[PDB]
Amino acid sequence: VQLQQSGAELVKPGASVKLSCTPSGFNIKDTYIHWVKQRPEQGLEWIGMINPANGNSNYDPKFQDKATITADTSSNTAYLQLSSLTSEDTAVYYCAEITTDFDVWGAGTTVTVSSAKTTPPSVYPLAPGSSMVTLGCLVKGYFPEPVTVTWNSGSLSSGVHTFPAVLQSDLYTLSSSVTVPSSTWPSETVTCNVAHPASSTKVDKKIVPR
Amino acid sequence: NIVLTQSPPSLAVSLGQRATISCRASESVDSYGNSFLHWYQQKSGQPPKLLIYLASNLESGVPARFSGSGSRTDFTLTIDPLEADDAATYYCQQNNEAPFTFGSGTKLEIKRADAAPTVSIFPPSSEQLTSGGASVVCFLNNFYPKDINVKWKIDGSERQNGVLNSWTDQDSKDSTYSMSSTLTLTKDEYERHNSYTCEATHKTSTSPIVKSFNRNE
């Protein structure tokens, strides 16, 4: 049983966006659907809920002016419409069924409110200048979030640290490290794999001794 | 709104020991003897997960080291004995009266033995140089506690501009933290100097851990 949520949104300040949420395994008509906001590094905030059986929705007063929750029981889909977007609306929005003894939570839909342009990362290999060895890759100059990083296509997952991106001049940069036994590399190949869903790109960068 | 105020806002507690987190409501969340109060755990990068419902009932599949107690406006979550995988932010939430508000949140840190970082330094790649830029990267990995200081030097001189730092959340397995420090420079300026140094100072020693390279080598 899940709540499936619509895809990431990048939208201009002042515009509107409408997010959608569709259960797999149950009907919204039989329950209540809630929306919950979380700004980057901040706490959970209950926006509101709807009963799709009678059309009644209820809101936190902080959100009632710009947020509107609707539902369509013929497509089993609930919606959250946000108007007059500002940077304070950049957040993850969770669709949830919150009841007295049980919850179901969606994975969340990210909304970025920005005029900046979508751009793929450059990915650079990080090999030592000269028991265990640490390697890395630098993922530079992409927009918007997120990227996902793996090593050897998921086969190396121990010893990995992928650092939160930092924002500069409308571009993000992150790095990822991996640590392997010194006899593993460079005899065996180590590759970081970087996906950027906004640009429909992936990059596989092999770490090569300099 | 019914306002839910958590305390403390953060704490660090040793493995094997008891952690207790408090939630205070601005008015009662009870009706007919039931307290309409949830507790949620939120791990790094994940949605929140329901732990406790009706203030004191354990959600199916949650371990029994989590318990809740209290009534009306005063509630507690206790985790005992604390495990490493319990590193997370915890929220109370009420469903007595709309809006169904969440508490302010409590960040729980697992206390472990001090551990010095493993420091590694990386010159710009040729790919990045070929494309016109130069970033020097320093990893400071698997250390505890989280507080750490990094200083960059170019030919012996301290450089503060163009440095950006990022920290991981606490590791779920070993309870350490890691940090990355990136010094960004024009390629011109990079090729203008020779020795590049990353120095880490952590409470585990009064001597910095110093990693270095020379561009012309």
Short mmCIF file of all heavy atoms in Angstrom, two decimals, chain B residues 13 23 33 45 49-50 56 84 86 93-94 96 102 114 133 136 150 163 165 167 170 175 182 189 192 196 208:
data_model
loop_
_atom_site.label_atom_id
_atom_site.label_comp_id
_atom_site.label_asym_id
_atom_site.label_seq_id
_atom_site.Cartn_x
_atom_site.Cartn_y
_atom_site.Cartn_z
N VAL B 13 22.93 11.23 23.81
CA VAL B 13 22.77 10.22 24.82
C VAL B 13 23.56 8.99 24.41
O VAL B 13 23.61 8.65 23.23
CB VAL B 13 21.29 9.87 25.00
CG1 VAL B 13 21.17 8.62 25.86
CG2 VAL B 13 20.53 11.06 25.57
N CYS B 23 6.92 16.62 25.23
CA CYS B 23 6.03 17.37 24.33
C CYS B 23 5.00 18.02 25.22
O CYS B 23 4.29 17.33 25.97
CB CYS B 23 5.32 16.41 23.33
SG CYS B 23 4.10 17.17 22.19
N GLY B 33 -10.97 10.27 27.71
CA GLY B 33 -9.91 9.43 28.22
C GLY B 33 -8.84 9.03 27.22
O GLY B 33 -7.89 8.39 27.59
N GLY B 45 17.02 12.06 5.14
CA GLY B 45 16.51 11.81 3.81
C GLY B 45 15.23 11.00 3.62
O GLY B 45 14.93 10.62 2.51
N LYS B 49 7.96 8.46 10.05
CA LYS B 49 7.41 7.15 10.30
C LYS B 49 6.73 7.21 11.68
O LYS B 49 7.34 7.63 12.69
CB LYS B 49 8.56 6.14 10.35
CG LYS B 49 8.17 4.74 10.81
CD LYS B 49 9.29 3.74 10.46
CE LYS B 49 9.98 3.22 11.71
NZ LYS B 49 10.93 2.11 11.43
N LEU B 50 5.50 6.73 11.74
CA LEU B 50 4.74 6.66 13.00
C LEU B 50 5.28 5.62 13.96
O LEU B 50 5.35 4.43 13.62
CB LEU B 50 3.28 6.32 12.69
CG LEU B 50 2.31 6.29 13.86
CD1 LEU B 50 2.32 7.62 14.61
CD2 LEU B 50 0.92 5.94 13.35
N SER B 56 0.43 6.25 23.95
CA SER B 56 1.15 5.18 24.63
C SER B 56 1.15 3.85 23.88
O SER B 56 1.73 2.89 24.37
CB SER B 56 0.55 4.96 26.04
OG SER B 56 -0.81 4.58 25.92
N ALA B 84 22.13 2.67 17.99
CA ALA B 84 22.74 3.60 17.01
C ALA B 84 21.80 4.04 15.89
O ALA B 84 21.86 5.17 15.37
CB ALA B 84 23.99 2.99 16.43
N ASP B 86 18.85 4.76 16.13
CA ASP B 86 17.88 5.69 16.64
C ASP B 86 18.29 7.16 16.43
O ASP B 86 17.51 8.07 16.70
CB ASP B 86 17.60 5.42 18.12
CG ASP B 86 17.08 3.97 18.39
OD1 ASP B 86 16.52 3.33 17.48
OD2 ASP B 86 17.28 3.45 19.51
N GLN B 93 2.79 15.10 17.46
CA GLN B 93 1.76 15.61 16.56
C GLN B 93 0.40 15.30 17.23
O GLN B 93 0.23 14.22 17.77
CB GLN B 93 1.84 14.85 15.25
CG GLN B 93 1.03 15.43 14.12
CD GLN B 93 -0.21 14.68 13.74
OE1 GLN B 93 -1.00 15.19 12.94
NE2 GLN B 93 -0.42 13.49 14.30
N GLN B 94 -0.56 16.22 17.16
CA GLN B 94 -1.89 15.96 17.70
C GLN B 94 -3.00 15.93 16.65
O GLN B 94 -2.98 16.68 15.67
CB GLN B 94 -2.26 16.97 18.77
CG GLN B 94 -2.45 18.40 18.31
CD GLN B 94 -3.81 18.72 17.75
OE1 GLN B 94 -4.81 18.03 18.03
NE2 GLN B 94 -3.86 19.77 16.93
N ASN B 96 -6.38 15.83 17.89
CA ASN B 96 -7.62 16.14 18.61
C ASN B 96 -8.46 17.22 17.91
O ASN B 96 -9.69 17.14 17.90
CB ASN B 96 -7.30 16.62 20.02
CG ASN B 96 -8.53 16.68 20.90
OD1 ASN B 96 -9.30 15.74 20.98
ND2 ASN B 96 -8.68 17.79 21.61
N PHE B 102 2.15 19.64 14.26
CA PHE B 102 3.32 18.95 14.68
C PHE B 102 4.07 19.79 15.68
O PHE B 102 4.06 21.00 15.58
CB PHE B 102 4.26 18.67 13.50
CG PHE B 102 3.77 17.60 12.56
CD1 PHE B 102 2.90 17.93 11.52
CD2 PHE B 102 4.18 16.29 12.71
CE1 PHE B 102 2.43 16.96 10.65
CE2 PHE B 102 3.70 15.32 11.84
CZ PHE B 102 2.86 15.65 10.80
N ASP B 114 35.05 9.47 21.39
CA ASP B 114 35.76 10.37 20.50
C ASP B 114 36.55 9.61 19.44
O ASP B 114 37.04 8.49 19.68
CB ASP B 114 36.70 11.32 21.28
CG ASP B 114 35.95 12.28 22.16
OD1 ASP B 114 34.70 12.23 22.17
OD2 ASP B 114 36.59 13.05 22.89
N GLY B 133 38.65 25.54 -14.75
CA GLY B 133 38.43 25.77 -13.31
C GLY B 133 39.40 24.99 -12.42
O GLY B 133 40.14 24.14 -12.91
N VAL B 136 40.03 22.40 -5.10
CA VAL B 136 40.84 21.50 -4.28
C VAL B 136 39.93 20.94 -3.20
O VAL B 136 39.18 21.72 -2.57
CB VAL B 136 41.99 22.24 -3.60
CG1 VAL B 136 42.95 21.25 -2.89
CG2 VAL B 136 42.72 23.09 -4.60
N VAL B 150 38.51 23.42 9.96
CA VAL B 150 39.37 23.21 8.81
C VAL B 150 39.96 24.56 8.33
O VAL B 150 39.24 25.57 8.21
CB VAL B 150 38.61 22.49 7.67
CG1 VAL B 150 37.47 23.34 7.19
CG2 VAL B 150 39.53 22.14 6.49
N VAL B 163 36.07 29.02 0.07
CA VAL B 163 35.97 27.73 0.76
C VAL B 163 34.51 27.41 1.10
O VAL B 163 33.83 28.20 1.75
CB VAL B 163 36.75 27.75 2.06
CG1 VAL B 163 36.53 26.44 2.86
CG2 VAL B 163 38.22 28.02 1.77
N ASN B 165 31.95 24.25 2.76
CA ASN B 165 32.01 23.11 3.66
C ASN B 165 30.64 22.50 3.71
O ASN B 165 29.65 23.22 3.66
CB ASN B 165 32.35 23.55 5.08
CG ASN B 165 33.74 24.12 5.21
OD1 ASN B 165 33.98 24.99 6.04
ND2 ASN B 165 34.66 23.59 4.47
N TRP B 167 28.57 19.04 5.85
CA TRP B 167 28.68 17.98 6.82
C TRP B 167 27.59 16.92 6.53
O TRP B 167 26.47 17.28 6.17
CB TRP B 167 28.50 18.58 8.22
CG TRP B 167 29.14 19.95 8.37
CD1 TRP B 167 28.90 21.08 7.63
CD2 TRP B 167 30.10 20.33 9.36
NE1 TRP B 167 29.67 22.12 8.08
CE2 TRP B 167 30.41 21.69 9.14
CE3 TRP B 167 30.71 19.66 10.42
CZ2 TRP B 167 31.32 22.39 9.94
CZ3 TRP B 167 31.61 20.35 11.21
CH2 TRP B 167 31.91 21.70 10.96
N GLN B 170 24.56 12.27 11.17
CA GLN B 170 25.20 11.19 11.92
C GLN B 170 24.96 9.83 11.30
O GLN B 170 23.86 9.49 10.91
CB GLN B 170 24.75 11.20 13.38
CG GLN B 170 25.55 10.25 14.28
CD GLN B 170 25.21 10.40 15.75
OE1 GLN B 170 24.05 10.65 16.12
NE2 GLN B 170 26.22 10.21 16.60
N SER B 175 27.85 5.90 14.20
CA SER B 175 27.61 7.09 15.00
C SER B 175 28.64 8.23 14.81
O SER B 175 28.68 9.16 15.62
CB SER B 175 27.52 6.70 16.47
OG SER B 175 26.47 5.79 16.62
N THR B 182 35.82 22.29 0.29
CA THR B 182 36.25 22.54 -1.07
C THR B 182 36.74 23.97 -1.22
O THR B 182 36.01 24.91 -0.93
CB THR B 182 35.11 22.32 -2.06
OG1 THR B 182 34.63 20.99 -1.89
CG2 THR B 182 35.62 22.47 -3.51
N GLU B 189 44.89 31.35 -10.84
CA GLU B 189 45.44 31.45 -9.53
C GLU B 189 46.01 30.14 -9.00
O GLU B 189 47.08 30.14 -8.38
CB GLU B 189 44.46 32.05 -8.54
CG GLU B 189 45.17 32.31 -7.23
CD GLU B 189 44.37 33.12 -6.25
OE1 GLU B 189 43.12 33.00 -6.21
OE2 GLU B 189 45.01 33.84 -5.47
N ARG B 192 49.43 29.56 -10.23
CA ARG B 192 50.27 30.65 -9.73
C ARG B 192 50.99 30.28 -8.43
O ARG B 192 51.87 30.99 -7.98
CB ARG B 192 49.33 31.85 -9.43
CG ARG B 192 49.84 33.25 -9.69
CD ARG B 192 49.10 33.96 -10.84
NE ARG B 192 48.01 34.91 -10.49
CZ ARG B 192 48.13 36.04 -9.76
NH1 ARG B 192 49.24 36.34 -9.10
NH2 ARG B 192 47.07 36.83 -9.59
N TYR B 196 49.60 23.31 -1.38
CA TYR B 196 48.22 23.46 -0.95
C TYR B 196 48.00 22.59 0.26
O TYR B 196 48.33 21.41 0.25
CB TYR B 196 47.25 23.13 -2.09
CG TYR B 196 47.29 24.13 -3.21
CD1 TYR B 196 48.24 24.03 -4.23
CD2 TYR B 196 46.44 25.20 -3.21
CE1 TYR B 196 48.33 25.00 -5.21
CE2 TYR B 196 46.52 26.17 -4.18
CZ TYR B 196 47.43 26.06 -5.19
OH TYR B 196 47.44 27.04 -6.17
N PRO B 208 47.02 19.97 14.91
CA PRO B 208 46.20 19.75 13.72
C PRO B 208 46.64 18.53 12.93
O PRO B 208 47.80 18.13 13.03
CB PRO B 208 46.36 21.03 12.90
CG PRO B 208 47.41 21.84 13.58
CD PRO B 208 47.46 21.37 15.02
#
